[model samples]
Target: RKKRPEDFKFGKILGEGSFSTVVLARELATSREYAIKILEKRHIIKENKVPYVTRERDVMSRLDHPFFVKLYFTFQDDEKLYFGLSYAKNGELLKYIRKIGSFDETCTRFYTAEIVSALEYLHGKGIIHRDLKPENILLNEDMHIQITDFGTAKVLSFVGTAQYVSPELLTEKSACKSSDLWALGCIIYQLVAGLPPFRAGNEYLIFQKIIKLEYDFPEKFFPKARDLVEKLLVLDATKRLGCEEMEGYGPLKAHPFFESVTWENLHQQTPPKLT
Candidate 1:
C-alpha cells in the first residue's frame, strides 16, 4: 500500500517552477526516495494552469518508456496536488553538455536516437511535447536520456520556445507532432554546434528567419546529420520530417544518420562518454 503525502518526510528542495516545487522526499516506512512535485491548488487556478496540469497528468500517466520519466503515483490534499516521480540521479543533460562544451557525433547520435524513440511513442499516442530542450531532458544514473517536464505539453497545442520552435508555429501559431520533430532538429543542432541554428538580435528577427525558413549547415556540421535536420526543419509543417505521412517514424528511424541505431536493442548499445 502507498503512503499518503503526510507519511513522507520532505527533504531538500530539488527544483521549483512557476506553480510547483519539486522536492526530495523519502517514505517514512520504506525509506525510498522520490522527487515529489507539489502544486498549490490556488496558484494553479490563479495562473490558469488547469488545462496544462490536466494534460500533463493525463499524458504522463499514459506514457511508459525507458527514455521518459516515470510517475509513480498521484494524490492531492485540499490545497495542493502531489505527484511522486522518479529521481534522475544524473541530473540535467544541459549541465553535462555545458561541462563538455559539446558532444561529438557518436554522443549526439545516441542522445538524438533516444529522443526520436520517445517522440515516436508520444506522437503515436496523440501527445505533443511542445517544449523539447536540453534542460527538460534529464540524465539517468547510466547517463541515458530521461525526458522530463510536461507543464507546457499538450495533446496538440502550439506551445514552446521560439529558438527551438518550428516555422508553422511562427506563421500559423499551431503545433503538432511534426513541431516536436522541428524542435528535435534544433536540439540535434545545438548538441553538435553548441548553439541553435537560428538566432538574431531579437526574437522578432528570429521569428522572421524562422518564418522564412532560413538556416544553414555550417562547415563544421557533420554532413551525414545534415539530411535529417534539413528534413525536420522544413518550412512546411506538412512536409516536415516524422510527419504522419510515414508509418511509425519509419523514415526517421531509417535515415542515414541513424543507420547505426538498432531500435530493438538501442538501450543495450554503449552510450557516449560524457567526459
Candidate 2:
C-alpha cells in the first residue's frame, strides 16, 4: 500500500544538480503535482561522501519553515534516490534573473528579507544551509521563495547544546550559521548585480581572487547596501557581524539596508512577482 515509482506519472524536468535531477510528477491516485527529486546512486559516491539522501530525508521531514519546499514522499531504487516535494511552478530564481536583468533595490531587498527570515528560522533550529544560491531558491505558485536542497553536510543539531552557534564557531568543524551570512552577502550582491561578486577564468583563479579579497563593487551598489555586504564578506569569518549578535542577527537586522523589512510578520509580507 506504500507509494511507489508507479504512483508518480513523470512529466517535465524542473531542475538538475551535479548529482540529482528534479522532475515534475503527479500522484496518479490524487493527481496532485510534486517534484520527484532524483539522486543517482552512480554519482552519489562520486560527488557526496555523506549519506545525504537519508540525512536529507530526515532533515526535510523535521523542517517546517514556510520557505522550504514541502516534502510529500520518499522513493528509491538500487540505482537512485528520490524525493517528492512541492513543485515551484514559477521555477528557479535564475529564470527571473534572466528576464529582469537584475532586481532593483526594492525587489532585491524583498528577496533578502525573505531569505533572512528563512535563514533565521533555520538558525533557530540549529541548522545552516551551506549552499544558498539563486538556483536553490525557487518560486512557488504564490511567487514566494521556497528554499530547496539544504546542503545537509552540516547540521548543528547533533550537539546537545547549540553553544557553538556563534560568529567564531569551532573553526575545526569548519562551518556555522555565520557561514550562511557570507553566502547571504554574495547572494545580495548577485541579486543586485545580476551575477556573482567573484568570478574568474577558472575555479582556481576564482579562489585566489576571493582569498585575496580582490573584487570591487559596481557604481550602482548603494552605500548602505555596500556597507551591509562588506560586513559579511569579510576574510576572517569571525568578524562577520550577524552571528556575533545576541539574538540572531539582532544588530544586522537593525542595519539600515533592512529598514523596510517587517521581520516580525515576515510571512504576511508581500513577495515580488517573478512571473
Candidate 3:
C-alpha cells in the first residue's frame, strides 16, 4: 500500500456503485485529470468475489480500442483498490439521452457503428462483455462511446445480463459475437425511442419476454428504426445481425438510411463527438 491518499487530490465525487466510488482526481505532479474508481476490499472478499482490481485490470489491460476507455494504471491501499482510467468528463451516455430527446437515425447509426467495431474487436480476442447497458457505456471527451465498466464481464460464463442476454445465452448455450449485436439492438432501441423493448417490475415476466422474444417497435416513436431493430433482435442467434453479417445481410449495409456514410472509411474511425 505504498500509494497514499496524498498522491492525488480527489475532487468531486462523481458517482457510486455497489462496491466502488468514482471520483474526479488530478495527478499531483503533472496535474492531469483522471476518473479514479476505488473498490472496497472487504466487500470483494465478503462476497467471495475476485479482487475488484483483478477482474477490471485483466479485462482492461487486454482491451485497446479507441471507443473503449484506456486504463492508465491500477494500484491499491490497505482498505481499497484503485483504478485510474481515462476521464470521461462528459459522463455516461445515459445522461445524454436523458438531457436530449431520442436520437435520430444518423446519430444512432454513428454510435451503433462505433459500438459494432468495438464488439468485433473484443469478440475476436475471445472476450465477452456480458453487460452492455447504457450505464456502463461512457462518452469520452469527444462524446464518442468509451465502453467502460467490466465488473460483470466474463471470459467464460454462461450467464449474462438478464435483459441484454440473447436467447442462446439464456438457454445456457454458448455466447458469441452476436450477443453484442443483440445488446447493440437493445441500445439502439433506447437511443432512438427512449426505452428498452420490454419492461416490468417483476423478474419472471421480464424473463418471459426475453425467452419468448416479445418486443415491438411502435411506429409513432420509431417507424424508421423498427425494421433495423427487428433484424438485430431476433431470438435465433443463427440469424442475428453482427459485424460479419452486416455487409451482405439484406439492405443493411446499403440501407438508404446510411446513404451519408462512407462505410469503408468508418472501419476503424474514432467517432468525433466527445465531451
lDDT of 2 by residue, 220-245 (tens): 98777889889888867767767754
lDDT tens per residue, model 3, 117-172: 67767777777787788887887766677888887666745465666767777676
Each prediction's total of clashing residue pairs, residues at least 3 apart in sequence or on different chains, is: 0, 0, 9
TM-score for each predicted model, relative to the true structure: 0.93, 0.86, 0.85
lDDT of 1 by residue, 34-143 (tens): 88999999998998889878888888888798888889999888898999888888898788778998888888888899999888888888888888988889988788
TM-score ranking, high to low? 1, 2, 3
- Give the top-scoring candidate (lDDT): 1
lDDT (CA) for every model shown? 0.84, 0.75, 0.74
Model 3 segments more than 4 A misplaced: 1-4, 51-53, 156-162, 221-224, 243-259, 263-275
Q: Model 2 misses residue 143 by how many Å? A: 1.4
Identify the superior model by lDDT, candidate 1 or candidate 2.
Answer: 1
Q: Tell me the lDDT of candidate 1.
A: 0.84
Q: Candidate 3 — which pairs collide?
A: 141-274, 141-275, 142-273, 142-274, 142-275, 143-273, 143-274, 143-275, 144-273
Which of 2 and 3 is ahead in TM-score? 2
